[PDB]
A paper describes a structure:
Cas12a (formerly Cpf1) is an RNA-guided Class II type V-A CRISPR nuclease which cleaves DNA following recognition of a 20-nucleotide DNA sequence containing a protospacer-adjacent motif (PAM). Unlike Cas9, Cas12a directly catalyzes precursor crRNA (pre-crRNA) processing to generate a mature surveillance complex whose crRNA bears a hydroxyl on its 5’ terminus. Using single particle cryo-electron microscopy (cryo-EM), we find that AcrVA4 recognizes the conserved pre-crRNA processing nuclease of Cas12a and the specific chemistry of a mature crRNA bound within the enzyme. This specific association serves to position AcrVA4 proximal to highly conformationally dynamic domains that are locked by the inhibitor to cage the enzyme in a state incompatible with dsDNA binding.
Numbering used by the authors:
A (entry chain A): 1 to 82, 91 to 246, 250 to 279, 293 to 534, 542 to 560, 576 to 581, 682 to 1074, 1085 to 1226
B (entry chain C), C (entry chain G): 128 to 233
Amino acid sequence: MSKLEKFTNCYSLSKTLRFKAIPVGKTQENIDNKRLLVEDEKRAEDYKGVKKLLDRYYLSFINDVLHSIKLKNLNNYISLFRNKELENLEINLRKEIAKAFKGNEGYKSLFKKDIIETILPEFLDDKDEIALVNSFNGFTTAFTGFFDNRENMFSEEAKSTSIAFRCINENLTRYISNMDIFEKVDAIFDKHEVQEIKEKILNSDYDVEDFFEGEFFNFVLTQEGIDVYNAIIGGFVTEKIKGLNEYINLYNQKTKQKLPKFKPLYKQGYTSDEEVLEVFRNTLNKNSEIFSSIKKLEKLFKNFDEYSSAGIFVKNGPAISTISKDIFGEWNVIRDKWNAEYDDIHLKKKAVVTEKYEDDRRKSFKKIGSFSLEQLQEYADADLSVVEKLKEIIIQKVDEIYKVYGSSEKLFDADFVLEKSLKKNDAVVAIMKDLLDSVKSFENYIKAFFGEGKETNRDESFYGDFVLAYDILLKVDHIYDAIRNYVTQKPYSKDKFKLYFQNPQFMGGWYRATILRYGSKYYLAIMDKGNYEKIFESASKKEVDKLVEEGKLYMFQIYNKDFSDKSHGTPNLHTMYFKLLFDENNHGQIRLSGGAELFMRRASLKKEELVVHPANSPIANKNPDNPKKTTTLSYDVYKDKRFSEDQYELHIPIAINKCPKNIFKINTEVRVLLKHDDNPYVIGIDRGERNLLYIVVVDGKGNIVEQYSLNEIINNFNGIRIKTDYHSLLDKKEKERFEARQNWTSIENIKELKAGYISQVVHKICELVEKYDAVIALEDLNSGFKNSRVKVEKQVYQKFEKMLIDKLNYMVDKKSNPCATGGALKGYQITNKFESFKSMSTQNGFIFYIPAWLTSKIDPSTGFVNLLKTKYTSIADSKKFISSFDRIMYVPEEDLFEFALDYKNFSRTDADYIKKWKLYSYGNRIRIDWEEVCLTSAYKELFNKYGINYQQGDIRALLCEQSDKAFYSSFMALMSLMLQMRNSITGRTDVDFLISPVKNSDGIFYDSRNYEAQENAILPKNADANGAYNIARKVLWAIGQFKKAEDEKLDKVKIAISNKEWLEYAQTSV
Amino acid sequence: IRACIIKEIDLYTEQLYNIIKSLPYDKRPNVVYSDQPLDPNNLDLSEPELWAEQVGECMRYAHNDQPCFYIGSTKRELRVNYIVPVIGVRDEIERVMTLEEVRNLH
Amino acid sequence: IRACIIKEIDLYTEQLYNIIKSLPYDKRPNVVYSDQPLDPNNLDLSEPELWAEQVGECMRYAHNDQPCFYIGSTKRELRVNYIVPVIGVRDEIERVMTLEEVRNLH
RNA sequence: AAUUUCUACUAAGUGUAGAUAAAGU
Ligand SMILES: [Mg+2]
Ligand SMILES: [Mg+2]
């Protein structure tokens, strides 16, 4: 009556097993004597040519259909633009455009065989490239993806990469702003002046003002229209003709007034160290487009005060936190000023601050588009000008850019020659990375001042110049990505090309392809234009080998290191899948659906570069936790031997559970089974600071069944058992990164090491799940933060959750019998298919996503949590704090200090349930540069040092009489570190205990150091065990909620546990 | 003089390979690496190209059996041909160890 | 020319030491031994002083860490400083093996 | 440090443990 046994054969799934084909007999010279590997390499090299030709034809078709188009909704847009009556109209406009595209009499051919067969061999009419467009005759399928991606531009889904979005959302806005700027900047002009020469030289037929009319936007839809408009804007040689922006500059230089300039419309990997370095020299030299953009932005931001502060803006997001950090002290000052001004309006005279109120305030804030500079000036203080600080910090960033340029004079001079390769040279890559990092930091910083765009009173005098400079600067992103992907590049390469064998319909079924097998060897026989086993009519090995010798057959051998004869351990998972394709216990579970694909990878490493471990010489072992410290092999060990030869890869698709029968909803069945179960286990996972991942398995009543670190992955084999400490490997990699000149390669190495680690943790968690029939408990990554000491960051943790979803779609035990429940043929399907990183929330089959609020700084034996705000601000606030306690006295029996508080008298303490806590000065706390402090002795020291008796009792009144400014500072300091539960020495010393200042019903304070020296412990051993324990107890609360509801209202039960309910549960469960 | 200098540079790096091949990876020294022969008898610091990092694996070239050393991790693919042990962490190099101070490591 | 010749002779004998140190004693080659440096690139037979015997132990001099080889048994106390592997049993020497034909032995 | 491919290896000697949905953009 187990839970998992019902979640097999649920839904369908698909995978591709990749193998390596080995030519058998004289197949390779029979292939080389027909040159069946040069037609296909030529086709793989002509793919890009035909791609460019199809792009050119697409551009011709686009400029054709964009000629026969005139909108009827554009005048309404311009009339209503200069919050919901406009978006319907703009989506109507995009739908009109998309219908004009999809309404032509030729759009049908654009993504089918006709565009290669008839159209493109006619639109071109060049005997050189008609050869190209005729080579791909019958191979239309080779473009299936290209077409399926080259049609998302002719659509209207408004994603960042589409023609409609470009023409409307990014162009019409600039056109309307240009109409405004032309209406404003006029009457400085004459036909005798440069106006008539503009018209004559660039248009020659109609007036120039016609390009600032409203319904003439249905002229800049075509790329040539954009070109002529940007010509009359900026200036277009035929005689260098000046444009409107520099006529404005000429006016603003004649007399001094910052008059706005127009905005131009939009326009709808490297392979050698010398190419990379010359691209660097070209795009980033001291007279390039980018350095000139930097100089222009410098002159602007140093001329930053002659622009009206009410017109500038700053976008709302991470930019606001960074701006507050750089201006208003630290992270959250702007946010708290906005919260103060929001309470002064939407909060009564009462202290009723509720989590729903705080959440609606947070939502209202996060929905604010952007903040002006006058607003951010009101939030400031006396004699602090926000524009001066922004100007000075931007000038500091610019001067740092200039300093790095002055430190990098050498990479620009023509005499420079490369001594070493770029991937092995790290001085020049350090220079390039430092420059790119500084420039991209500046680019990402000044990205804030583009404050949401959609707003009324933008100071166009500033934003003209700003966007003029910034639209050239943001090319550093592509340059950075290209250079980085070039440097972090393996010395080998996995570039391959599919082989067709003069047959468009090749291998697409089970065609001229079959999978033979002989003994324990499986063969792929490809007909051209002993006893085996066909896949079951037999053959004769003699005549099939005769065919192989003749040439009528192309027998490859399917092979991976598990088909070898010297392999004795456990086979790979996909090897087991493949071997099961042809098994008897396999009825229809894993079947051969679709057609295979035979690729071909050429040798990338020259045999002069091959490096080897010489035979009969002791090799050092890299695993510190290995007993055997050396190894002596009787043969050679080549490094990357697989990439030093040609290899025929083979991709075979498989469809698991093609004809399912146990079809139902997985989530509701999980809820029903968790309800009807009397003791459901739960595996809580939490990201620690000293541990990569930490597991705590908790039964259906809150009792810890297991708790251990996932620091070391344990591989079992042959009965032996060897451990690997991935935390030490990660520390070694981080130390190496600290030593290296540049850390482009180190970061990729760390990412791939973490990916491998989570690939091991996936199996760990699966074998934990199929041992207790437990239910997993993961942090909800959408809402929350981890304070920068957690090793596993959010990206790799998101990849870990994705890997767990993709594994739990079909969970297999390799060691188990295949036909047995849990084996490869009957694997558990206890999770739905992955959809997106945003839908990973609140449930996924056997996976519950849980917010990580109040999980690590909470006493796991009493539920206590420090909800106070013990930060020193002034004498009055600390006096009110001290006067808010119900009693503060010295208990002489225990030699402690009791602080009898009451959470009712304190602000923002509504989540709590047992409002009357009594917390002492028990134990020692580690403050932060770290220093250990015994609390009671520190209190006695402070009291005696400032002349204060404490044996009296209720010394609250005796304590709020101190006139000294530093007394209350020290007092609130050690009162803040008294409520510090998670203590840890910074300098990596593994002391991460977790003490609590309150005592439980039995009268003993929880101290983790009493449980770390134990196995089979009932309470968490440290803060991370506490996090996992609480993340499990939240799912236990959700299970209890399921038990409260009926068997039809289960689907609606909300399980997003709120702070009130969570603290209530944690404080009454005991 | 150039022929004898290269011979000395190679005999020294062959001895260094034979020595360093047996130390456990956590004991390997910090070295200064390059592709042109390195001469410890004349090697002078303060050159803006010397960076002290730690040796990794020690393998042999398959075509002419020349020893090569992987600086840092093998997965970093920073394979060099000539190294020299130093007492240093960064551009602040103190001194050059000898063929016996590397044997004392283990 | 004499300095480079001695350097080559010593690098070759150091490699020979590092190789022969690991073979089991029953596989050791037959060699031609002497106390002056031996140059395999020019070594010509028919000299009435070359006797092919089998290497024994391989130890290091305590004062300058120079490799020395015991020809025959260690108990024979025929310790030499420079050897060269040959295919021979007596004054009838056939040819001179190379630094890889000695590695193929085990 | 060998791999269909990835990570950590050498894991008892031409491999070990786990994972792996490919193509195209
Ligand atoms: Mg295996
Ligand atoms: Mg590896």
